[PDB]
Scaffold this active site. Structure first.
Site, PDB file in Angstrom:
ATOM      1  N   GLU A  14       1.186  -1.289   0.162  1.00  0.00           N
ATOM      2  CA  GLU A  14       0.365  -0.118  -0.048  1.00  0.00           C
ATOM      3  C   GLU A  14       0.835   1.574   0.036  1.00  0.00           C
ATOM      4  OE1 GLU A  14      -4.720  -1.342   2.450  1.00  0.00           O
ATOM      5  OE2 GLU A  14      -2.069  -1.277   3.609  1.00  0.00           O
ATOM      6  N   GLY A  80     -12.484  -3.320   2.248  1.00  0.00           N
ATOM      7  CA  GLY A  80     -14.009  -3.819   1.466  1.00  0.00           C
ATOM      8  C   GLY A  80     -15.208  -2.781   0.907  1.00  0.00           C
ATOM      9  N   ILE A 154     -13.362  -8.392   6.818  1.00  0.00           N
ATOM     10  CA  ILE A 154     -14.476  -9.632   6.898  1.00  0.00           C
ATOM     11  C   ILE A 154     -14.457 -10.014   5.065  1.00  0.00           C
ATOM     12  CG2 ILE A 154     -16.795  -8.370   6.512  1.00  0.00           C
ATOM     13  CD1 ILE A 154     -14.823  -7.744   8.763  1.00  0.00           C
ATOM     14  N   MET A 175      -8.907  -2.034   8.708  1.00  0.00           N
ATOM     15  CA  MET A 175      -8.582  -2.445   9.954  1.00  0.00           C
ATOM     16  C   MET A 175      -7.807  -1.134  10.134  1.00  0.00           C
ATOM     17  SD  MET A 175      -7.320  -6.806   8.818  1.00  0.00           S
ATOM     18  CE  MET A 175      -7.346  -6.971  10.695  1.00  0.00           C
ATOM     19  N   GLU A 176      -7.636  -0.081  10.357  1.00  0.00           N
ATOM     20  CA  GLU A 176      -6.362   0.655  10.862  1.00  0.00           C
ATOM     21  C   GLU A 176      -6.957   1.719  10.567  1.00  0.00           C
ATOM     22  OE1 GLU A 176      -5.279  -1.057   7.648  1.00  0.00           O
ATOM     23  OE2 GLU A 176      -4.499  -2.670   8.749  1.00  0.00           O
ATOM     24  N   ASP A 199     -12.324  -5.927  -2.562  1.00  0.00           N
ATOM     25  CA  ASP A 199     -12.670  -7.020  -2.787  1.00  0.00           C
ATOM     26  C   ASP A 199     -14.262  -6.102  -2.212  1.00  0.00           C
ATOM     27  OD1 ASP A 199     -10.972  -6.467  -0.179  1.00  0.00           O
ATOM     28  OD2 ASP A 199     -13.010  -6.906   0.635  1.00  0.00           O
TER      29      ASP A 199
HETATM   30  N1  LIG Z   1     -12.712  -7.424   3.545  1.00  0.00           N
HETATM   31  C1  LIG Z   1     -11.543  -6.849   4.579  1.00  0.00           C
HETATM   32  N2  LIG Z   1     -11.656  -6.498   5.372  1.00  0.00           N
HETATM   33  C2  LIG Z   1     -10.835  -5.723   5.878  1.00  0.00           C
HETATM   34  N3  LIG Z   1     -10.036  -5.112   5.841  1.00  0.00           N
HETATM   35  C3  LIG Z   1      -9.943  -5.034   4.380  1.00  0.00           C
HETATM   36  N4  LIG Z   1      -8.914  -4.380   3.117  1.00  0.00           N
HETATM   37  C4  LIG Z   1      -9.458  -4.708   1.972  1.00  0.00           C
HETATM   38  N5  LIG Z   1     -10.519  -5.592   2.061  1.00  0.00           N
HETATM   39  C5  LIG Z   1     -10.895  -5.967   3.519  1.00  0.00           C
HETATM   40  N1  LIG Z   2      -0.903 -10.393   4.477  1.00  0.00           N
HETATM   41  C1  LIG Z   2      -2.418 -10.823   4.592  1.00  0.00           C
HETATM   42  C2  LIG Z   2      -3.399  -9.798   4.380  1.00  0.00           C
HETATM   43  C3  LIG Z   2      -3.786  -9.424   6.030  1.00  0.00           C
HETATM   44  S1  LIG Z   2      -5.299  -8.063   5.317  1.00  0.00           S
HETATM   45  C4  LIG Z   2      -1.669 -11.403   2.907  1.00  0.00           C
HETATM   46  O1  LIG Z   2      -0.729 -10.921   2.722  1.00  0.00           O
HETATM   47  O2  LIG Z   2      -2.611 -11.881   1.949  1.00  0.00           O
END
Ligand SMILES: Nc1ncnc2[nH]cnc12
Ligand SMILES: N[C@@H](CCS)C(=O)O
Ligand SMILES: Nc1ncnc2[nH]cnc12
Ligand SMILES: N[C@@H](CCS)C(=O)O
Lengths: 233, 232
Positions: A14, A80, A154, A175-176, A199
């Site tokens: 990212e 997501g 998720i 998640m952040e 996604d």
């Molecule tokens: N489905 C998902 N749940 C949580 N963090 C995400 N980041 C990207 N897709 C996500």
């Molecule tokens: N570290 C994981 C993603 C978690 S959000 C991966 O590389 O698929």
């Protein structure tokens, strides 16, 4: 000191595009966080690679704000897409952030609210408007609203429905974002989420995420680079 | 150069006993965190009042380690006792901490594990051993084991059941221990939970908490004081 834009991404993928464009780049490791400082198009940038989840983001944003003291924080990366009409690559901008996994209702707090904090962290109006404006000029599909964070990836329609039952207007999940917003609220630093969809957070979220994280990073980074050129002082 | 003991509590009530025994006391505010520095019985102390929850604890503990550089961190305060036999006032010492609300199993991580972290944070054996030695020396009721953290106040038998289904050995639940452990893990600082029961995390937890938070703070703080005197 001229303006310094703070940018936070959880994963290496990212921050890779912004990181590889910085000149005079220095790298400081603080515990689980990596902070890059340097210039993009003559602008001072402090780029945080935090690691995944609320505590990793909180450690890194705290280290970022204490070390680099940026004037604002933009949270870049993937998300997501839970709102109808969102497709992989689409830009999601936060109006506000809330935890979907916090619950102190036992003492009368609103769901998602932690004591001593607002139930929702309001994103910076000027940054959010700039993101949507730059996104429209670039012709990027963009949506603006509620981003819900939690220490969960998720990956099911049931999990999406549980979050929507508590937060009907939820647009994106990750998640952040809310953790970075909580740190910026506590340090009084303007904050906004500028992520892109990787996604739909459904039963196919883990496959989609692996296939479209690069797209999400590219679309997200292109909008952030546009915001960097506009933010001067 | 002399040993400095870091102590973390989430609420004002959980740190006030220790705050009120510090001499040469200074107070520093960093964001949502309050850090007191001074001495207790001649020993250097860095006491953090972090606020409730994983992020408040992470901000606070990050600020504490960067500012005070304590040699170890002891998490004091209250907890929901879920293991059978736990009564309000009993001491719970962590052997390990795990998030009951973390889930990245979609990518093959263990339930409760965050990527780039161990599935469970191992508490410092020497600090946990010291806590149990001091507790037993004062006939203080003590249990040692798994503490599960989450951004939730557990207040129902169903929520306890779901946590037990994911972590069968869970002994106690609270909202900051695992976050402090993750920060201490990232900074390589020895850590341990020395909390006391205020409730059972059941339907009566909130009322029990209001009556027994003070007893939990008193029993936790009393044991942390015994630890301070023995550490060197
Ligand atoms: N489905 C998902 N749940 C949580 N963090 C995400 N980041 C990207 N897709 C996500
Ligand atoms: N570290 C994981 C993603 C978690 S959000 C991966 O590389 O698929
Ligand atoms: N039931 C409970 N849930 C979470 N944190 C607690 N601290 C004390 N009791 C608790
Ligand atoms: N506000 C609550 C504690 C937070 S969990 C109380 O006063 O008891």
């Amino acid at each position: 000191n001229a303006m310094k834009i703070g940018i936070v991404g959880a994963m290496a993928q990212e921050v890779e595009i912004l990181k590889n464009l910085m000149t005079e780049r220095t790298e400081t490791r603080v515990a689980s966080a990596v902070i890059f400082e340097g210039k993009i198009n003559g602008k001072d940038i402090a780029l945080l690679q935090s690691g995944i989840g609320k505590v990793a983001a909180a450690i890194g944003t705290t280290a970022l704000l204490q070390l680099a003291k940026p004037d604002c924080v933009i949270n870049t990366g993937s998300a997501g897409g839970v709102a109808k009409g969102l497709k992989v690559g689409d830009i999601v901008i936060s109006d506000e952030t809330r935890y979907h996994d916090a619950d102190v209702t036992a003492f009368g707090y609103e769901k998602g609210q932690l004591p001593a904090n607002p139930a929702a962290f309001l994103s910076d109006k000027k940054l959010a408007d700039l993101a949507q404006e730059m996104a429209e000029k670039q012709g990027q599909s963009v949506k603006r609203g509620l981003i819900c964070s939690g220490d969960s990836f998720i990956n099911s329609e049931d999990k999406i429905a549980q979050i929507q039952a508590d937060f009907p207007n939820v647009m994106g999940v990750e998640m952040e974002a809310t953790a970075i917003a909580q740190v910026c609220y506590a340090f009084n630093v303007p904050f906004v989420v500028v992520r892109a969809i990787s996604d739909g957070g459904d039963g196919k979220a883990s496959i989609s995420f692996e296939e479209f994280l690069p797209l999400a990073a590219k679309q997200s980074s292109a909008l952030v680079l546009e915001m960097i050129d506009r933010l001067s002082s």
